[PDB]
Amino acid sequence: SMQIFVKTLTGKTITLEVEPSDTIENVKAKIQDKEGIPPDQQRLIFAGKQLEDGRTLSDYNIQKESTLHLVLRLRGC
Amino acid sequence: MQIFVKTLTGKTITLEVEPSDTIENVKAKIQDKEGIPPDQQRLIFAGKQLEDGRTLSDYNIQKESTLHLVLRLRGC
Amino acid sequence: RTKQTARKSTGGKAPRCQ
Amino acid sequence: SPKCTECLQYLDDPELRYEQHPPDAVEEIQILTNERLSIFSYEDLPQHKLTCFSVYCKRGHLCPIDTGLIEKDVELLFSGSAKPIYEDDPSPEGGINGKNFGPINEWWIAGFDGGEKALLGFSTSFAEYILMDPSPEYAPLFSVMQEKIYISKIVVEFLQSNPDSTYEDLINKIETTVPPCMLNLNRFTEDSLLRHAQFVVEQVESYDRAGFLSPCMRDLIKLAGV
Ligand SMILES: [Zn+2]
């Protein structure tokens, strides 16, 4: 039970309800359920480092009200 | 001696090499392990781009030094 | 639940790129 | 009256701006290995932010990227202070100066979140760059470009949210939407869309192909003249 934000490069803010034990893949999967964005296109950055899918929020000290930066591998022609 | 190669993706490549080997050979040693042609490779050490005609002994590259590899994309 | 991909629009592209 | 061999621009003509950059600046390859831009697959490519930027030909002439100099296959270089992709401060301090990026293989408009900013992106043969603020010497050339970027975002975002919306509703949405302060505009007009009708349609078409039967799209295109 925690509230954390996820900020895109355009300034859009998404609020997520997570647990400190949840993994980064759970965060990506939560982003997909709220903004419809496929997790394969998602990259999460905290404290200047890209988060690995296998680690948890407690490992990166992602405290309540921390802001995650979402960078997307864009589809283009 | 063992020398490391840091990629932009954060991947580290461990190579064993002699100071007499050239940068063209250093790039040739990188291809076998990862499969990247030497033309696509750009080697940086201490903020200086390693030219092909030189050796590691030329740039005072001692043992256990870390080279930084930049890749030129396949096309354009 | 519908899923929407992240996308970008091509403004300009050099001819040498194919 | 002699033109540039690269950008076809008259040398005698005033208002011609030659690019200027600090002596601190370095080439593109040297910047991508700076630890302050590190955030740690090979198909994956680096992506950084670039503020206080300026675009110029090989001869040092500041060039627009609307004119079609990239479609003409003229090699356009650019410069600025690179920053990590997650930074929001558009101030040059905290960013690493760079000279002669590129050449520009492709420029694209990103960010259809509904968020506040529209994203402009440069693709080089070595890395990708999300632009922020143009340099104070390149702002006049980038002024006209900035409207096209945001207008395209307004249309694409409004179509995605309202696919059955009308052309009259589209003019309202554009006119109602308050322009950001970076545009230095008080309001959007129908003229703001009619001036770049060919461009907006070509942006929506590219957005649909990356992953256009709407009546407003049609009505627009027929009255667009394109
Ligand atoms: Zn010129």
Way the structure was solved: X-ray
Distance CA D131, CA D118 (A): 10
Distance CA A31, CA A37 (A): 7
Q: How far apart are the first and last CA of chain D?
A: 34
Distance CA A26, CA A23 (A): 5
Please indicate, yes or no, whether residues D5 and D94 belong to a single structural domain of this protein.
Answer: yes
Query: C9: which chain A residues are within 8 Å (Cβ-Cβ)?
Result: 76
Please indicate, yes or no, whether residues D8 and D76 belong to a single structural domain of this protein.
Answer: yes
The strand pairing partners of D33, in sequence order, are none
Contact D101, D129 (CB under 8 A): yes
Q: What order of strands is seen across the sheet that includes strand D47-56?
A: C9-13, D106-110, D119-123, D128-131, D47-56, D77-83, D96-101
Please indicate, yes or no, whether residues D75 and D127 belong to a single structural domain of this protein.
Answer: yes
Q: Is D103 part of the contact surface with chain C (CB cutoff 8 Å)?
A: yes
Which residue has tokens 């890395």?
D127
CA of D90: how far to CAs of A16, B27, D49, D107, in Å? 27, 37, 9, 20
Please indicate, yes or no, whether residues D126 and D18 belong to a single structural domain of this protein.
Answer: yes
In a domain, B8, yes or no: yes
Q: Domain holding D212: CATH number? A: 1.10.10.2230
In a domain, A77, yes or no: no
Largest interatomic CA distance in chain A: 41
**Domain boundary residue, one of D146, D169, D197:** D146
CA angle in degrees (0–180, nearest 5) for D26-D29-D35:
85
Please indicate, yes or no, whether residues D101 and D154 belong to a single structural domain of this protein.
Answer: no
To test the contact with chain A by mutation, choose from C8, C10, C17 the residue with the greatest count of A C-beta atoms within 10 A, namely C8
Largest interatomic CA distance in chain D: 54
Contact D38, B10 (CB under 8 A): yes
**Between β-strands A67-72 and A42-46, what pairing exists: parallel, antiparallel or unpaired?**
antiparallel
- The number of folded domains in chain D is 2
Q: At residue D112, what are phi and psi to the nearest 5 degrees?
A: -115, 50
Which residue has tokens 């403004």?
C11
- SS3 state of residue D1: coil
Per-residue tokens: B55: 């050796």
In a domain, A59, yes or no: yes
Q: Domain holding A65: CATH number? A: 3.10.20.90
Distance CA A77, CA D112 (A): 16
Chain D stretch 149-168, residues whose beta carbon is closer than 8 A to a beta carbon of chain C: 152, 156, 160
Contact D170, D147 (CB under 8 A): no
Domain that holds residue B17: 2-71
Listed in sequence order, the residues at least 6 apart from D181 whose beta carbon sits closer than 8 Å to its beta carbon are none
The interaxial angle of helices D197-209 and D139-161, nearest 10 deg, is: 60
Distance CA D28, CA D34 (A): 11
Distance CA D101, CA D76 (A): 9
- The number of folded domains in chain B is 1
In a domain, B76, yes or no: no
CA of D216: how far to CAs of D93, D114, D171, D205, in Å? 44, 20, 10, 14
In a domain, A34, yes or no: yes
Largest interatomic CA distance in chain C: 41
Distance CA D196, CA D152 (A): 9
Residue of C nearest to B73 (CA): C17
Distance CA A47, CA D171 (A): 42
Q: Which residues have a beta carbon within 5 Å of ligand 1, which is an ion?
A: D 4, 6-7, 9, 57, 59, 61
CA of D74: how far to CAs of D58, D79, D129, in Å? 9, 17, 19
Please indicate, yes or no, whether residues D40 and D80 belong to a single structural domain of this protein.
Answer: yes
Per-residue tokens: A62: 């992602």
Within 10 angstroms of residue D76's Cβ, the number of other Cβ atoms is: 27
**Domain boundary residue, one of D111, D146, D181:** D146
In a domain, A52, yes or no: yes
Residue type at D49 in one-letter notation: K
The strand pairing partners of B3, in sequence order, are B15
Omega before D103 within 30 of 0, i.e. cis: yes
**Domain boundary residue, one of D146, D178, D211:** D146
Distance CA C5, CA D49 (A): 22
Please indicate, yes or no, whether residues D76 and D154 belong to a single structural domain of this protein.
Answer: no
In a domain, B33, yes or no: yes
CB-based burial, A59-68: b 16+ in 10 Å, e otherwise: ebebeeebeb
CB-based burial, B36-63: b 16+ in 10 Å, e otherwise: bebebbbbbbeeeebeeeebbeebebee
**Residues across chain B:** 76
Please indicate, yes or no, whether residues D127 and D171 belong to a single structural domain of this protein.
Answer: no
In Å, how far is C1's CA from the nearest CA of chain A?
8
Q: At residue B14, what are phi and psi to the nearest 5 degrees?
A: -95, 120
Domain that holds residue D104: 1-146
Q: Contact D86/A71, CB-based, under 8 Å?
A: yes
Residue of B nearest to D26 (CA): B47
Per-residue tokens: B1: 């001696």
The interaxial angle of helices D167-176 and D215-224, nearest 10 deg, is: 80
Q: Contact A41/C7, CB-based, under 8 Å?
A: no
Distance CA A60, CA A49 (A): 10
In a domain, B14, yes or no: yes
Distance CA B29, CA D138 (A): 44
Of A8, A11, A48, the CB nearest to D84: A48
Per-residue tokens: B69: 């590899």
Please indicate, yes or no, whether residues D96 and D137 belong to a single structural domain of this protein.
Answer: yes
The candidate with the shortest Cα–Cα distance to A42, out of A19, A73, A65, is A73
Contact D33, B68 (CB under 8 A): yes
Residue of C nearest to A72 (CA): C6
Please indicate, yes or no, whether residues D140 and D153 belong to a single structural domain of this protein.
Answer: no
